[PDB]
Design a protein around this ligand. Structure first.
Ligand SMILES: CSC[C@H]1O[C@@H](n2cnc3c(N)ncnc32)[C@H](O)[C@@H]1O
Ligand SMILES: CSC[C@H]1O[C@@H](n2cnc3c(N)ncnc32)[C@H](O)[C@@H]1O
Ligand SMILES: NCCCCN(CCCN)CCCN
Ligand SMILES: NCCCCN(CCCN)CCCN
Ligand SMILES: [Fe+3]
Lengths: 354, 353
C-alpha cells in the first residue's frame, strides 16, 4: 500500500478535491488506453483539475513522462500498474446509439431540418459557460423525452437553451406549448426568429438571469422541464431546482445533464441528496455520455488550458455528460430563493471550462 | 374531474400512491397493446396498481375485456382524445436493447455460458427466483468490465440464480469471486461449473441474508452484484449487505430495481436509503437493462390472482433497471438482523410470488 499511499498523499498536497485510490487507478487505466490528456480526462471519468493533480503527482514520483505531447507511463509506471493489476480501460459502448439507449432514425428529417436552421447559431459565449451539444444529441433528447411520455400535448419549460432544444421541440410539433428563457439575448432572439420561420406560435421566450427567483407565471404551470446547467451546487439549485418549481405537481418530469468532467462523485452525492432530500424528486434514469458537447472556441482562455501540462486543442469531442431524468411525487418541491453569486455560479474547485 | 373520479375510484382499491400521471401511463399503454402483461411493461407502473387502474376504468365505462384483450370502449376512446393521451412511443436502441453496451466482443463467453447453463436450476417460487437471459448476464459482465470493476478485482455475488458468478468464471477477469445463496441447488450448481471450468479462486456458500454476514466477509471486496427482492427490508439485506462487503471508498455495486414491483414513491424511498442511510452515490440507472426469463410458478402468484385476464405471458414482459453505485468517504453498509419471513419478498407493490 506504500507506493499508492504516497501518490494519494502527493495529490492531496495539490487539490482540495477528494482523492481515493480508485481516483489514481481510473487515471492510470486511462493513461494505458491513451496519451492524450483530454482523452485521459474522458476515459477516467474524474474531474479535470483532479486528473491534472494526479498526472502531476505521477510525473513528480517518476511514474509518468511527457513525450511528443503524450502522457506516458515510464518503466517505473509500467511496474506500478503491473504490481497493482491496473489494466487499460475497456469500453463496450453500443456503437449504434452511442450509449444513449435511444436511436434517432425516426427523427432523421427533423435532424436535417434542425441542422439547416441552426447552421448559424450563436457561438458559445465564455461569459455564460456555453457549449452546445451536437445536433444528434439535441434530437436524442427529444426522442428520449417523447419515449417517456413527456412531450405530446405537454407544456414544456426550457431553462437555458444554447443547445436549441426548443427549436427541435418546435420542429417536432409535440408540445402543447413551450416556454424558454436564457440570460443570452443572442439566443432568445435566435429562438424567436426560428419560431417565426417555423410558424410555431405557442412559444414564449424571455431573457432572464436565473440567479433571481422565477416570476409567478412560470410557477406550477408546466408538465416537463429541461435544462443543461453549470455544475456548482448553487447552479444546480438555480437551474434544476427552479425547473422543479415550474412543475404543476406530482407526476411531472425534468431532464438535465451532469458531467464527470466538472463534478466529482462526491459532488454527485451532494447533488443527489439535494434532489432526493431538498426537492423530494426521484431519479428515474441516469445515462452515461448521453450528451456530446461540441468543442468550444474559447478553450485557450479557460482554467482547463492553464492547468494542463500539455496544451494542444482537443481533437475530438472529449466533453460529455450523463442525462438525468427526474420525476415529481407527493411532496416534491422546487427552489424559489435568490442566489447572490457572481462568476461563482459557474466556477468552483472542480470546474475548469471557463 | 373525469380524471378525478377515476383517481378517487383507484384509491378505494389500493394503498399504492395514485396520480393523474399513473392513469395516463396506463391509458397510453392500453392504446399500444391489449395484453395485460404488456400494459404493465409499457406503463412502468407496478402490477397491482395497474390492475386497480384497469378495474376502475372498467367499472367506470372506459375499458372492456374482449378476446383476452384489454381495450378502450368508445367512452374510453373519448377520454384519451379529450385528455390528449396518446399511445406510448418507444425509440429503444435495437442493437443494444437499450443496455448501452454491446456484447459482440463476448460472443465466445455467451456460447460457453449457454452451454454450461443448459440445465440450470429452475426458478423456485419460495426464493422469489427468476433468472435473466444469457445475453443479459453477459451484458452485466460487459458493463462491469467497462467501468473497471472486474479485472483483478475481488467480486462478491449476493444471490445468484442469474449465474453471474459462472459468467465471471468464464471471463477469467476477477482475481477472485465469492458467491452466496439461500438455495443449495444454486450453490451446488456453481461448485459444479467451477470444477468443470477449473476455476480455483471461487468461494461458494449457502446463507440466508436475513442474518448479518460473517465478520470474515466484511470490508474485503472491490465489487458486489446482487439482483434483490424489492421490499425496503430486502434492499437492506441484499444491497446494503453488499455495501458492507466493500473495502472502502472507490468500490462498486450493481443491482436491478423494477418498475413492475416498486412504485416511483418506493424508488424515492430506496434512493433515500442509498444516499442517506448508506451514503453511496448512484452512477448509472439504465432502463430495462435486465430481461428476466418467464418463470414456471406464475400461476401460483399474486399476479395471476389479480389479473383480469389470465393467460401465461407470451414474451419476457418482466424487466428491471440496472443501478450502479459507488462508495465514497463515509459510505457504510447494513449489518443488522432482519426478522421478517415471507415479507422479505412480499409488500403491497409486489406480485410475483
Ligand atoms: C449553462 S450553459 C446553458 C445555458 O444557460 C444559459 N445561462 C447561463 N447562465 C445563466 C443564468 N444565470 N441565467 C439564465 N441562463 C443562463 C446559457 O446562456 C446557456 O444557453
Ligand atoms: C431474490 S432472487 C435472487 C437470488 O437471491 C436468492 N435469495 C432469495 N432470498 C434469499 C435470502 N434470504 N438469502 C440469500 N439468498 C436469497 C435466490 O435464491 C436467488 O438466487
Ligand atoms: N464551459 C463549456 C462547457 C459547458 C457545459 N455545461 C453547459 C452547456 C450546456 N449546453 C453543461 C454541463 C452539464 N451540466
Ligand atoms: N418473482 C420473480 C421475479 C423476481 C425478480 N427479482 C429476483 C430475481 C433475480 N435474478 C429481481 C428484481 C430486480 N430487483
Ligand atoms: Fe444501442
Amino acid at each position: 500500500g506504500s507506493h499508492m499511499r504516497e501518490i494519494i498523499e502527493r495529490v492531496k498536497e495539490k487539490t482540495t478535491i477528494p482523492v481515493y485510490e480508485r481516483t489514481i487507478e481510473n487515471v492510470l487505466s486511462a493513461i494505458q488506453a491513451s496519451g492524450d490528456v483530454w482523452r485521459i480526462v474522458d476515459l477516467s471519468e474524474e474531474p479535470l483539475p483532479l486528473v491534472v493533480a494526479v498526472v502531476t503527482a505521477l510525473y513528480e514520483l517518476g511514474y509518468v513522462a511527457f513525450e511528443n505531447n503524450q502522457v506516458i507511463l515510464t518503466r517505473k509506471g509500467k511496474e506500478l500498474v503491473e504490481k497493482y493489476g491496473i489494466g487499460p480501460r475497456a469500453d463496450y459502448t453500443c456503437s449504434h446509439c452511442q450509449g444513449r439507449t435511444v436511436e434517432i432514425d425516426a427523427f432523421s428529417e427533423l435532424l436535417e431540418q434542425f441542422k439547416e436552421i441552426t447552421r448559424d447559431r450563436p457561438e458559445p459565449a465564455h461569459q455564460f459557460d456555453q457549449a452546445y451539444v451536437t445536433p444528434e444529441t439535441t434530437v436524442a433528447r427529444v426522442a428520449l423525452m417523447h419515449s417517456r411520455g413527456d412531450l405530446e400535448n405537454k407544456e414544456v419549460f426550457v431553462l437555458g437553451d444554447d443547445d436549441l432544444t426548443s427549436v427541435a421541440l418546435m420542429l417536432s410539433g409535440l408540445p402543447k406549448r413551450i416556454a424558454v428563457l436564457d440570460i443570452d439575448e443572442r439566443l432568445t432572439k435566435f429562438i424567436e426568429k426560428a419560431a417565426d420561420e417555423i410558424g410555431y406560435e405557442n412559444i414564449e421566450i424571455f431573457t432572464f438571469d436565473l440567479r433571481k427567483p422565477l416570476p409567478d407565471y412560470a410557477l406550477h404551470k408546466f408538465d416537463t422541464f429541461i435544462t443543461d446547467p453549470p455544475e456548482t451546487v448553487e447552479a444546480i439549485r438555480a437551474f434544476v431546482g427552479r425547473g422543479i418549481a415550474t412543475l404543476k405537481g406530482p407526476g411531472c418530469a425534468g431532464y438535465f445533464g451532469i458531467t464527470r468532467r466538472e463534478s466529482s462523485l462526491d459532488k454527485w452525492r451532494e447533488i443527489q441528496r439535494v434532489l432526493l432530500n431538498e426537492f423530494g424528486v426521484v431519479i428515474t434514469d441516469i445515462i452515461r455520455n448521453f450528451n456530446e458537447y461540441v468543442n468550444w472556441g474559447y478553450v485557450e482562455e479557460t482554467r482547463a488550458w492553464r492547468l494542463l501540462p500539455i496544451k494542444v486543442k482537443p481533437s475530438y469531442n472529449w466533453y460529455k455528460s450523463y442525462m438525468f431524468r427526474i420525476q415529481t411525487l407527493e411532496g416534491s418541491k422546487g427552489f424559489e430563493d435568490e442566489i447572490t453569486v457572481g462568476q461563482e455560479l459557474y466556477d468552483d474547485e472542480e470546474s475548469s471550462t471557463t
